[PDB]
Each structure stands twice: as C-alpha cells, then as structure tokens.
Amino acid sequence: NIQVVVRCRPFNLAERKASAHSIVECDPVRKEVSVRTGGLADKSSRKTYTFDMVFGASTKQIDVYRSVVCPILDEVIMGYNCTIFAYGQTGTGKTFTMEGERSPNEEYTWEEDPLAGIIPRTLHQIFEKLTDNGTEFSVKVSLLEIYNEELFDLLNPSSDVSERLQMFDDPRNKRGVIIKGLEEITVHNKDEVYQILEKGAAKRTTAATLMNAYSSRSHSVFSVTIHMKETTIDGEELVKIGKLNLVDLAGSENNINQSLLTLGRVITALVERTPHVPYRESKLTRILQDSLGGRTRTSIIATISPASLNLEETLSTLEYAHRAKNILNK
Numbered sequence: 001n002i003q004v005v006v007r008c009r010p011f012n013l014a015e016r017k018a019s020a021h022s023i024v025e026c027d028p029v030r031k032e033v034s035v036r037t038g039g040l041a042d043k044s045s046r047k048t049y050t051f052d053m054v055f056g057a058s059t060k061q062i063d064v065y066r067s068v069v070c071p072i073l074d075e076v077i078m079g080y081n082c083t084i085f086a087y088g089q090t091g092t093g094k095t096f097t098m099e100g101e102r103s104p105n106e107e108y109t110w111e112e113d114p115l116a117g118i119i120p121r122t123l124h125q126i127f128e129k130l131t132d133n134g135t136e137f138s139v140k141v142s143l144l145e146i147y148n149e150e151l152f153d154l155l156n157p158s159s160d161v162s163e164r165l166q167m168f169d170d171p172r173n174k175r176g177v178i179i180k181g182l183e184e185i186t187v188h189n190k191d192e193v194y195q196i197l198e199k200g201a202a203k204r205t206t207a208a209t210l211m212n213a214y215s216s217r218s219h220s221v222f223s224v225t226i227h228m229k230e231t232t233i234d235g236e237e238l239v240k241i242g243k244l245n246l247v248d249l250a251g252s253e254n255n256i257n258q259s260l261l262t263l264g265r266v267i268t269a270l271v272e273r274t275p276h277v278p279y280r281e282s283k284l285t286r287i288l289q290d291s292l293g294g295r296t297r298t299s300i301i302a303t304i305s306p307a308s309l310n311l312e313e314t315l316s317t318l319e320y321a322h323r324a325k326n327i328l329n330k
C-alpha cells in the first residue's frame, strides 16, 4: 500500500569530465530499475527491482511534481493527511527533490524556477488552487528537525538553534505527540512563501556551524496544514482539514542515528507482521507513527546515484525501498 518511487540523479560535472559510466538503468514504462553489480558493459551481472514508479536521470522537477505530488496534494485538499519521505545516501538528491534549488545568476523568480522542488511547488500550488474556486482557507507551515535525538524549530525567528524543543505524549488522541513550543507560521499568501523558506535556510546555516555534519545527519519534517471552508456554487460549506508532511531524512549511508535506525526497524516489523512495532524507540517514529502503518497515505522517494563508486549504497537503498512496498496503512 505505501507507494515507493525511485529517482536516479544524473552525473555531476566532475563525473562528466571523468567520463563516468552509469551502473544504473531505468525503465519508467516498466517501473523498473536495473543495477550493474559485476562489471563490464560488454558482459555483466545485474540486479533488478520493480517499484511503483521509477524516474531516470533525465527526470526534471516538474515531472516529479505532476506525477507524484499533484495527486497526493489533491487528497490533502480533500481533508486527509499525507506524508512523503525522501530516503537515500547523502548526495543523491533527497534535498534537491524535496526542496529544490535556485537556478544560478538570478535567471528566474522563485515561483518559475524549474529547479524548484516539492515544498515550494506545493505551497505555491495550494494558493493557486484554492484562491480560484470559492474556498476560504488558512495555511500553516511548520519545520521541525531532528539531530542526535534532539528537536529543533528551524522557523522560529526569536529563538536560536541551541534551544531544543520538548516532546510529550498527547493525552487526547492516542499514538500522537505534542511538541512544546513548535512554531506554526501562517502563510497569508503566495508572496509570503519564499521569505519563510529563506528564513529556514538561513537558520539551518547556523545549525550547521553549531552541529557536526548537520545537513547530512538531521531529519527535517516540513508540515503544511490547510484549514478549509469550501462553499460550492450551491451553498454547501465543507469544513476540511488537511496536513502534508514532507520529510527529508538523514543520509542513509554507513556516528549512530537513533531515528534512522528505528525507522528501519519499524518498517521491518510492519512488513514482517510483527505484533510489536518499535515506534517509541526514536523521536522520528513517534512523531510520524501515523505515517508508518497508520491512517496517513504515505509515499517514499528513494534517491540513488548512477556512479559505480556508490554501488554498495545504491543496492542498500534499493533493497530498503523495495521492502517498504509491503507496508500497509489505513
């Protein structure tokens, strides 16, 4: 039930000049990804995996958004909760996929930049879709991050990255949690989106100077909650609440990342039908337990590299993402 898609990134500039051969091949029409394990394009051994969707190196940000995000956003707009994880080794495109980047030399505006990823596209699109049809709504975003099992708020502009947040069990709705002090910022309109993201980027820079390899070891959960009051052309007012969680996971390569370790164990217990699922052994899995065998529709995007130097990690990533397909939720 949990949908898993794989995204291979293209070779970089240093890999083009070194005339690198790709050990990965994608077949989108067949939802298949094949990896060269033995060696030689003349004769070789290979490993194949089938997923729900596979995107090769030529896949652009707009292809990812239209194919995977648009339908998930529709569901969120219907009043459901959805979560999208980005899993893969550092350098394979987790952040590029979830957030995207700016094209160099101020070539475009943020809302037209083709390098934009899921988060900016999603936020710009929520306003583009609800502003049209008569729907009163409010958008709240939150950015919670985890480093060495400590919680941080990367959007609060009056607290620094040395102030960790506290987490408690929610006595109201079971298997849910309360994060003391997590700031929820209201996004009044599309033109307010970009600076919110800029502020987050800037605060992440300070977190990076204070914590070792922060961008590689931290987990980031960017949540966008949409409170809606849709009035059809008749006079029916549908009050709906939808929440989308965009999770950029810590690099999967192999000191100890308790949340990453626990995520793997939670998935293993879920697909092996084990009665006890270790949700509580890490903050990530407690915060997102409804996304792992719960009532939230979730998808995983496994990012990989086509370079032969990353063979072991690419296989580990694919193998991990393949097992995830067997998780059932809702």
Ligand SMILES: CN(C(=O)N1CC(c2cc(F)ccc2F)=C[C@H]1c1ccccc1)C1CCNCC1
Residues within 6 Å of the ligand: 098, 099, 100, 101, 102, 110, 111, 113, 115, 116, 117, 119, 120, 143, 154, 194, 197, 198, 199, 200, 201, 204, 222
């Ligand atoms: C804001 N920014 C980005 O590239 N960003 C940062 C970013 C982002 C930042 C966060 F905290 C949390 C979630 C996010 F998604 C995504 C983009 C973006 C925004 C609109 C169009 C294309 C890409 C600056 C980062 C620092 N260099 C200049 C660009």
Ligand SMILES: Nc1ncnc2c1ncn2[C@@H]1O[C@H](COP(=O)(O)OP(=O)(O)O)[C@@H](O)[C@H]1O
Residues within 6 Å of the ligand: 008, 009, 010, 012, 059, 088, 089, 090, 091, 092, 093, 094, 095, 096, 097, 101, 251, 303
């Ligand atoms: N699909 C892609 N197309 C073009 N460049 C990419 C793609 N994916 C990743 N890259 C590039 O690869 C590098 C790895 O980026 P990043 O997203 O930060 O990786 P990660 O978050 O997995 O550690 C960046 O310089 C980025 O611009």
Ligand SMILES: [Mg+2]
Residues within 6 Å of the ligand: 094, 095, 215, 216
């Ligand atoms: Mg990263």
